[PDB]
Design an enzyme around this catalytic site. Structure first.
Site, PDB file in Angstrom:
ATOM      1  N   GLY A   1       6.703  -7.924   5.592  1.00 63.70           N
ATOM      2  CA  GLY A   1       7.569  -7.534   4.503  1.00 63.70           C
ATOM      3  C   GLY A   1       6.904  -7.476   3.146  1.00 63.70           C
TER       4      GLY A   1
ATOM      5  N   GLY B   1       4.835  -5.281   2.129  1.00 66.56           N
ATOM      6  CA  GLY B   1       4.738  -3.896   1.732  1.00 66.56           C
ATOM      7  C   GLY B   1       3.390  -3.245   1.941  1.00 66.56           C
ATOM      8  N   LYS B   2       2.617  -3.682   2.937  1.00 67.25           N
ATOM      9  CA  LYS B   2       1.364  -2.999   3.239  1.00 67.25           C
ATOM     10  C   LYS B   2       1.613  -1.593   3.768  1.00 67.25           C
ATOM     11  CE  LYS B   2       1.124  -5.270   7.759  1.00 67.25           C
ATOM     12  NZ  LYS B   2       0.285  -6.107   8.659  1.00 67.25           N
ATOM     13  N   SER B   3       2.715  -1.393   4.495  1.00 70.31           N
ATOM     14  CA  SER B   3       3.073  -0.052   4.942  1.00 70.31           C
ATOM     15  C   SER B   3       3.355   0.861   3.757  1.00 70.31           C
ATOM     16  CB  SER B   3       4.286  -0.115   5.868  1.00 70.31           C
ATOM     17  OG  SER B   3       5.449  -0.482   5.148  1.00 70.31           O
ATOM     18  N   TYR B   4       3.989   0.324   2.713  1.00 66.55           N
ATOM     19  CA  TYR B   4       4.205   1.099   1.496  1.00 66.55           C
ATOM     20  C   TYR B   4       2.880   1.514   0.873  1.00 66.55           C
ATOM     21  CZ  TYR B   4       5.896   2.241  -3.215  1.00 66.55           C
ATOM     22  OH  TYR B   4       6.178   2.870  -4.405  1.00 66.55           O
TER      23      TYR B   4
ATOM     24  N   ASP C   1      -5.837  -2.691   9.802  1.00 63.04           N
ATOM     25  CA  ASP C   1      -4.590  -3.385   9.509  1.00 63.04           C
ATOM     26  C   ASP C   1      -4.703  -4.794  10.080  1.00 63.04           C
ATOM     27  OD1 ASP C   1      -2.050  -4.219   8.923  1.00 63.04           O
ATOM     28  OD2 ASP C   1      -1.040  -2.883  10.335  1.00 63.04           O
TER      29      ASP C   1
ATOM     30  N   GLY D   1      -0.907 -10.907   9.517  1.00 60.13           N
ATOM     31  CA  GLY D   1      -0.795 -11.951   8.520  1.00 60.13           C
ATOM     32  C   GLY D   1      -1.122 -13.323   9.080  1.00 60.13           C
TER      33      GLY D   1
END
Ligand SMILES: CC(=O)O[C@H]1C(=O)[C@@]2(C)[C@H]([C@H](OC(=O)c3ccccc3)[C@]3(O)C[C@H](OC(=O)[C@H](O)[C@@H](NC(=O)c4ccccc4)c4ccccc4)C(C)=C1C3(C)C)[C@]1(OC(C)=O)CO[C@@H]1C[C@@H]2O
Ligand SMILES: Nc1nc2c(ncn2[C@@H]2O[C@H](COP(=O)(O)OP(=O)(O)OP(=O)(O)O)[C@@H](O)[C@H]2O)c(=O)[nH]1
Ligand SMILES: Nc1nc2c(ncn2[C@@H]2O[C@H](COP(=O)(O)OP(=O)(O)O)[C@@H](O)[C@H]2O)c(=O)[nH]1
Ligand SMILES: [Mg+2]
Lengths: 354, 433, 440
Positions: free
Chosen positions: A97, A99-102, A245, A248
């Site tokens: 959550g 925001g690495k995808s963002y 990627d 975490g």
């Protein structure tokens, strides 16, 4: 071995905005600061990094970085180094959550898109422009997951068997029978990414429902060739762009389960430590030639500890370039995760607090 | 109740296992027939660590003897303690390995490995809480070597939280007993470095030197060498069995000794030794015991620890001793020999004491060191390796069994990588450019 | 009424508990089995003092303690030893492998699965008590079972039991002498838990007791038993006020009030004046003044510090035996005039006095000689900062090169947490340097 570290903060999501959340991140110049909601009266923690990126609202005349700015900071130079016949590595990090995808993907609105779409579009546009009668280009893509020090193929729908790592004495480390597919433009480097992402291992813990459990590597092998006006035609220019990627970090307390759910996390943490040490060496090595010209001794960076480094050997050393981007969550609830991410970013070319 | 399983592959491993079991049976007071005849109940306080109970109040040892030559099994079963082992664990085949790693890893071992894994899984399930495994083999082999490495890999894949030990014998520099030794040694060490937490280093030449110069024996045989190795193994495993003023579990040793995950080769030792006639004059005290402990000639690896700069060291003591002697002696050994220790660990010696001494001695000590000087062993093998690989001296006998050339170069590269990692913490300062 | 429910964690805790309960049983006349001939001979009394024991109908007397540990070899020695019939069978020993000096293993990989039962047994013990004036937790820094399990247990107790006091007796690694190569990591990790939960934690160093035993007692070759005996005598001197009559008694709350000036500097030292052997027991008067003067001798301190390099914030004395108040006042006046013992400007009183009429008892065998007087000196000293700094340096020598971090990381601990704990230790050091500066 140039190292760049960037820390970005995402805006509020729907769930955070539904509740009366608060921001606990402040940033100025090239410095970041956080305040503890539990004990506001003690002191604000501060850190310094190579890049800081505030992103909350549109106008933000003081210290706002659109996606174009961060692309121009990292990806454009990285691709430029890629074209001249050198290896490139880009790392993404951030808790679930964060925001690495963002950061990496972004939205498909064609006004705020991440690093990967911009890099791929510029690559394909340059290839299409430059392809004259002499020049010719080729691009190949592969995707894999590292999981408990075992490598699995995400693109291949075959049985999820454990492949064997080998060391070719000239080409270096590589993986046996790893699926490789040809691509021609951006539309493809995605459908492949979506299909590979659908097959990644994932489970649910007490922290989040869809928390990842394995590292992912996206390899782009870029080959050039120059057709001179004679018979001696050679490639002599093979580049690797690696996009990693990274899952975490996690505490055993948050992962309130016994057995496999513990074990995976433990192994994950090991990688998330050792890679740090390796890059913590490169940066230092990078400082040697740059300022004090320390060349004596290969200073062989420890490289075989785990699998994640022992497979990215060629991309992270020698004369390559490495960028790392860490996402942060501004919500007051996720204080510990944000602090852990910031402390991890503090390594890898530590910088004093100005 | 901690519990450790034992496997022994190859002739050397089987002989060392027989001597180790004859030594442990004497220490715990087990009769050859399996009955119990002891002097105190404290021996049976923690008998579960190596043995299992039986219906007739017998005690069956926990061992899996694996081999490809039936001759060694026949010799062991007819020995003084041949009947102690249960028959079902004797698993073996025929046609041997012929001192070829390829036969003992890819061709022939693939059939006996299934049975060995079945038996070891059955044994592991029976324990209350498995702690770890022990394996014995000679590197310069082809039966013990390849099958031992295969079992190491399989056991690591199946049980990945149990400290897998290994007490192995490597090729000597000068005393060579086989012609294809370096190939087997290099391949097995490559397969071993990635799949173990704590492996010990025993050299035949060092044991012969200890037998000659120190013990003042005349005509040493294999029995004396097996005795030394058995004594060291028992000492190493001591603390799990009997109580003490301070104990050293196996995982305690693993956590304390190895600094980084790769660097896990250990140099063993045992004290004291009176050479059968100097016992009358020699005084058994902690200072004398530790003085003989750190002496070079006592060491069983044939790597002088004077070019080493000891990375870590552990000393498991056995006897009733005031600890002030132990602590002050260790501190004095550190301070007086500061050049032979690393600086970025502030103090790098661990200690442990068990109140119960060995039967027939007032005090004893077991040494488990970790020093960079072990590179002088590995590098030697590497040299011989290239000396037989540049011209392909005996390479065809391995490709006959389906082994590719790349697997040798990968092992050599890993060997050189291990040597270089050892070497970085070997210069006695940085201050360089 | 006046209970002091105690917990022993780790091997150091278990051995110290052996010594302490030997001393207590010899003091109160409790036989090893549990029966008490003394009260039956007297025909009615209060020899079954509630401060450390509980009484059943059949005349047996059970002690109020637990011995939690992960190594069965440490507790089975007591289970089948001489004291096998005294303790309840709920000694609460884990039948699982040791934590191997790893803080993470002792915290949240194998320290768990036991803590629930330990808290349940502690609750059952405390339910029998109408007092419960303070906990006594014995441990030793060094990781594995001890530090990690003590951290978890203190964290749970501070939440469940509220404001009840919790004294800690902690063994500290010596500067030059150590028995583990991951001790600095474990101690720097455990400070982050002991600072914010333990209300007043003492400190004892092995090397100091070794030197004290070498010099005073002429014991060339001491062992663990003598060290445990000295710690047992110290805790008995501290807790004697709650059991026997006295002219000026001091409760646990008095210790928690007077010896701590501010919440974050509650780390005092300890010592013991008449530590004298039998041969040297004669030829010495052992007046109150002499023992009180010998308390402040730097060579007799129980932790390797130099009090001359610091200032005394507060001091509390506990005298046991025939000591009348006039001599104590004279000794205090004589001590306060010397300029070697520098006092801070903001605490002009700086002393707390206490007297107990029970003389000290002699454990059979042992080393101490019978003395008709004794005094236990506790003081808060800034010089203790030095005792941290050396240890801190060791950490800073080892954390840079990333040694022994893989084992800890592979057991649930994040890499960052180390630094946080380290920073906290630095803050504590700074706080001491903030308090010792003279007022304007
Ligand atoms: C008569 C006597 O007490 O003399 C000693 C003796 O002289 C010494 C030299 C013994 C002797 O050992 C050797 O000579 C030897 C030969 C080959 C390889 C290694 C040693 C002894 O043979 C070995 C023998 O050791 C034992 O008996 C132990 O129980 C030993 N187990 C055996 O090897 C064993 C011996 C006889 C019958 C059954 C088993 C042991 C010790 C620790 C842990 C496990 C096992 C002892 C005390 C001695 C002799 C007889 C001379 C030593 O061996 C041990 C391990 O005790 C060598 O170093 C010690 C130090 C002893 O002082
Ligand atoms: N003074 C004193 N110290 C002890 C005693 N027993 C153990 N210690 C200390 O304990 C340290 C070892 O670490 P510990 O954690 O206590 O050992 P443990 O309690 O068995 O737990 P593990 O380390 O996990 O095995 C040593 O440095 C000793 O100083 C004792 O009886 N008296
Ligand atoms: N320490 C020791 N080494 C031995 C003994 N017997 C044989 N060896 C060694 O074992 C090696 C031979 O390997 P081996 O186990 O026989 O291979 P295999 O014949 O295929 O089983 C030689 O290098 C010997 O030095 C012994 O009793 N003790
Ligand atoms: Mg322990």
């Amino acid at each position: 071995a140039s190292v760049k570290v960037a820390v970005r903060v995402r805006p509020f999501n729907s769930r955070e905005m539904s509740r009366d959340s608060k921001c606990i991140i402040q940033m100025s110049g090239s410095t970041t600061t956080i305040v503890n909601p539990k004990q506001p009266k003690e002191t604000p923690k501060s850190f310094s990094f190579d890049y800081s990126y505030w992103s909350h609202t549109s106008p933000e005349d003081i210290n706002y970085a659109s996606q174009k700015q961060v692309y121009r900071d990292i990806g454009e130079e990285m691709l430029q180094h890629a074209f001249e016949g050198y290896n490139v590595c880009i790392f993404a990090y951030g808790q679930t959550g964060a925001g690495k995808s963002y950061t990496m993907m972004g939205k498909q609105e064609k006004d705020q898109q991440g690093i990967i779409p911009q890099l791929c579009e510029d690559l394909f546009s340059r290839i299409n422009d430059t392809t004259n009668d002499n020049m010719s280009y080729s691009v190949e893509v592969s995707y894999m997951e590292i999981y408990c020090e075992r490598v699995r193929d995400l693109l291949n729908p075959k049985n999820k068997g454990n492949l064997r790592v080998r060391e070719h004495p000239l080409l270096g480390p590589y993986v046996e029978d790893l699926s490789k597919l040809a691509v021609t433009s951006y539309n493809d480097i995605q459908d492949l990414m979506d299909s590979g992402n659908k097959a990644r291992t994932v489970a649910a813990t007490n922290m989040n429902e869809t928390s990842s459990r394995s590292h992912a590597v996206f390899n782009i092998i870029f080959t050039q060739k120059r057709h001179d006006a004679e018979t001696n035609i050679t490639t002599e220019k093979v580049s690797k762009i690696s996009l990693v990627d990274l899952a975490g970090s996690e505490r055993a307390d948050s992962t309130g389960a016994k057995g496999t759910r513990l074990k995976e996390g433990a192994n994950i943490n090991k990688s998330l430590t050792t890679l740090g040490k390796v890059i913590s060496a490169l940066a230092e090595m990078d400082s040697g030639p740059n300022k004090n010209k320390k060349k004596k001794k290969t200073d062989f960076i420890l490289y075989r500890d785990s699998v994640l480094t022992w497979l990215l050997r060629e991309n992270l050393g020698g004369n390559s370039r490495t960028a790392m981007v860490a996402a942060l969550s501004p919500a007051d609830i996720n204080y510990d995760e944000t602090l852990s991410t910031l402390r991890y970013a503090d390594r890898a070319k530590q910088i004093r607090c100005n | 109740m901690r519990e450790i399983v034992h496997i022994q592959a190859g002739q050397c491993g089987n002989q060392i296992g027989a001597k180790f079991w004859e030594v442990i049976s004497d220490e715990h007071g087990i009769d050859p027939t399996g009955s119990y005849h002891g002097d105190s109940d404290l021996q049976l306080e923690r008998i579960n660590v190596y043995y299992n109970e039986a219906t007739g109040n017998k005690y069956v040892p926990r061992a899996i003897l694996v081999d490809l030559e039936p001759g060694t099994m026949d010799s062991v079963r007819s020995g003084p303690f041949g009947q102690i082992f249960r028959p079902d664990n004797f698993v073996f085949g025929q046609s041997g390995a012929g001192n070829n790693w390829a036969k003992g890893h890819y061709t022939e071992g693939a059939e006996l490995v299934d049975s060995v894994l079945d038996v070891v899984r059955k044994e592991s399930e029976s324990c209350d809480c498995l702690q770890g495994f022990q394996l014995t083999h000679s590197l310069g082999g082809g039966t013990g070597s390849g099958m031992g490495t295969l079992l190491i890999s399989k056991i690591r894949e199946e049980y990945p939280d149990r400290i897998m030990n290994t007490f192995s014998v490597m090729p000597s520099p000068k005393v060579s007993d086989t012609v294809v030794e370096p190939y087997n040694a290099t391949l097995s060490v490559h397969q071993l470095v990635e799949n173990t937490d704590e492996t010990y280093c025993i050299d035949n030449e060092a044991l012969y030197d200890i037998c000659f110069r120190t013990l003042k024996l005349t005509t040493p045989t294999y029995g004396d060498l097996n005795h030394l190795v058995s004594a060291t193994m028992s000492g190493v495993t001591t603390c799990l069995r009997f109580p003490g003023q301070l104990n050293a579990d196996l995982r305690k040793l693993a956590v304390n000794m190895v600094p980084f995950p790769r660097l896990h080769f250990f140099m063993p030792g045992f004290a004291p030794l009176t050479s059968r006639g100097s016992q009358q004059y020699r005084a058994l005290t902690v200072p004398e015991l530790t003085q003989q402990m750190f002496d070079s000639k006592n060491m069983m690896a044939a790597c002088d620890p004077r070019h080493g700069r000891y990375l870590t060291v552990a000393a498991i003591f056995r006897g009733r001793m005031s600890m002030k002697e132990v602590d002050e002696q260790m501190l004095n050994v550190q301070n007086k020999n500061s050049s032979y220790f690393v600086e970025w660990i502030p103090n790098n010696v661990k200690t442990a004491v068990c109140d119960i001494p060995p039967r027939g001695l007032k005090m004893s000590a077991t040494f488990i060191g970790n020093s960079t000087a072990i590179q002088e062993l590995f590098k030697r093998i590497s040299e011989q390796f290239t000396a037989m690989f540049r011209r392909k001296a005996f390479l065809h006998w391995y490709t006959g069994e389906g082994m590719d050339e790349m697997e040798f170069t990968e092992a050599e590269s890993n060997m050189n990588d291990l040597v270089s990692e050892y070497q970085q913490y070997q210069d006695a300062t940085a201050d360089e450019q | 009424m006046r209970e002091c429910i105690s917990i022993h964690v780790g091997q150091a805790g278990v051995q110290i508990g052996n010594a302490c309960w030997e001393l207590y049983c010899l003091e109160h006349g409790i036989q090893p089995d549990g029966q008490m001939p003394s009260d039956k001979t007297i025909g009615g009394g209060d020899d079954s003092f509630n401060t450390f024991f509980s009484e059943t109908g059949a005349g047996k007397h059970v002690p109020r303690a637990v011995f939690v540990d992960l190594e069965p070899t440490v507790i089975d020695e007591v289970r089948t030893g001489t004291y096998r019939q005294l303790f309840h069978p709920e000694q609460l020993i884990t039948g699982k492998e040791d934590a191997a000096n790893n803080y993470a293993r002792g915290h949240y990989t194998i320290g768990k699965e036991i803590i629930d039962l330990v808290l349940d047994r502690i609750r059952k013990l405390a339910d029998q008590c109408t007092g419960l004036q303070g906990f006594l937790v014995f441990h030793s820094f060094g990781g594995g079972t001890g530090s990690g399990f003590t951290s978890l247990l203190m964290e749970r107790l501070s939440v469940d039991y509220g404001k009840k006091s919790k004294l800690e007796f902690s063994i500290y690694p010596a500067p030059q002498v150590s028995t583990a190569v991951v001790e600095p990591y474990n101690s720097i990790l455990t400070t982050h838990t002991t600072l914010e939960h333990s209300d007043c934690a003492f400190m004892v160093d092995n090397e100091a007791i070794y030197d004290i035993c070498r010099r005073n007692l002429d014991i060339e070759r001491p062992t663990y038993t003598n060290l445990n005996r000295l710690i047992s005598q110290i805790v008995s001197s501290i807790t004697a006020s709650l059991r026997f009559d006295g002219a000026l008694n001091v409760d646990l709350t008095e210790f928690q009030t007077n010896l701590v000036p501010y919440p974050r500097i509650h780390f005092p030292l300890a010592t013991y004046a008449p530590v004298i052997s039998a041969e040297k027991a004669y030829h010495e008067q052992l007046s109150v003044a002499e023992i009180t003067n010998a308390c402040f001798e730097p060579a007799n301190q129980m932790v390797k510090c130099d009090p001359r390099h610091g200032k005394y914030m507060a001091c509390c004395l506990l005298y046991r035996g025939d000591v009348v108040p006039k001599d104590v006042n004279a000794a205090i006046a004589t001590i306060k005039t010397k300029r070697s013992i520098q006092f801070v400007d903001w605490c002009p009183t700086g002393f707390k006095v206490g007297i107990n009429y029970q003389p000290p008892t002699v454990v059979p065998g042992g080393d101490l000689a019978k003395v008709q007087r004794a005094v236990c000196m506790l003081s808060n000293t800034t010089a203790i900062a030095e005792a941290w700094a050396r240890l801190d340096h060791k950490f800073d020598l080892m954390y840079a090169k990333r040694a022994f971090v893989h084992w800890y990381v592979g057991e649930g601990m994040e890499e960052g947490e180390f630094s946080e704990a380290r920073e906290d230790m630095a803050a504590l050091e700074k706080d001491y340097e903030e308090v010792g500066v003279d007022s304007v």
